[PDB]
Amino acid sequence: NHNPMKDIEVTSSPDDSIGCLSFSPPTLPGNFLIAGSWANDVRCWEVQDSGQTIPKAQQMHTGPVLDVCWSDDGSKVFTASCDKTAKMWDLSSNQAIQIAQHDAPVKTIHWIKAPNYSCVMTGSWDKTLKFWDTRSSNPMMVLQLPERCYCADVIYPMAVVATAERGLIVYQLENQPSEFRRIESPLKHQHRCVAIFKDKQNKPTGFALGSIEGRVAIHYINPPNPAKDNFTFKCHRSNNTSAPQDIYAVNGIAFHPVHGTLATVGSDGRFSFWDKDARTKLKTSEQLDQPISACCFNHNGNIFAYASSYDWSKGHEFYNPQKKNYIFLRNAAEELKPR
């Protein structure tokens, strides 16, 4: 009932609801998974090819951890928190230092490796997008956002930020980060998740964007017929019945690194696999007894990780501290292969 897909559970899962997941880069041998929770921690497990999980290390923020990411060499883990700061976490030494500070919670964190520079990008509810070299206390660059940062993604040379009030901005990253285009958002309700997808030549070419109204947008940066090539589709809904349709929130979107297909996880407690080129739904899971709060893939796309956690979609009265959170692992390479 808690694990209807009969998937593998990560042992020693977080004490509070899970906010973010992140797998190690391919520059690291094997697979390492990072999760931040609302109990203010950041944890790291080693996933093993047999499927067994081994807890490896844990760090601490003074407020809930909203985002995490890795550095290209897999030596450092970056954490972003509601205590208005972000930390650099050296796994081998198991020490973590502050590298960023904002005036509001820090919602998003990403690592930019460009041929000529490297930095950490932070997007925050203080309406700023800041970049840090991890040595100086002064940010290398500071850009203003149109409203509070709600989600973001980076695949050099491109970045996407989504904010409150349908704010949507693409960034070009070659040499120095700069604003590329402010998009009139294809979605009409709260932005919640964004993930960038690449073309047939591994070139970042567009993004997928999830709202709270059971909808995801497919947006190409520069297609030949944008009226037909860009589209939205409905997901994470109920239903043969005339009862009203129940519309849940899209909580996470991740693209499978080799197949180019995508996964979405939702407040309805399900995950769905999609082919955005064929425009088809490949799979939908069974329902879990609580929302799925986050998801992500490993580097080669052979582990699909999703987190069973309350997401406050119904407010404080539906939170049960009594009820346990899980991270589940699924091999869905074959499930996400097109056709």
């Binding site: 909808r215 589209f231 939205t232 589709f233 409905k234 999609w274 082919d275 425009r279 088809t280 739904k281 490949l282 799979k283 939908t284 499930e335």
Partner: peptide, 9 residues
């Protein structure tokens, strides 16, 4: 599972 068409707006 069962591949199905998307519900495109």
């Amino acid at each position: 599972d069962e591949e199905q068409p998307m519900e495109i707006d």
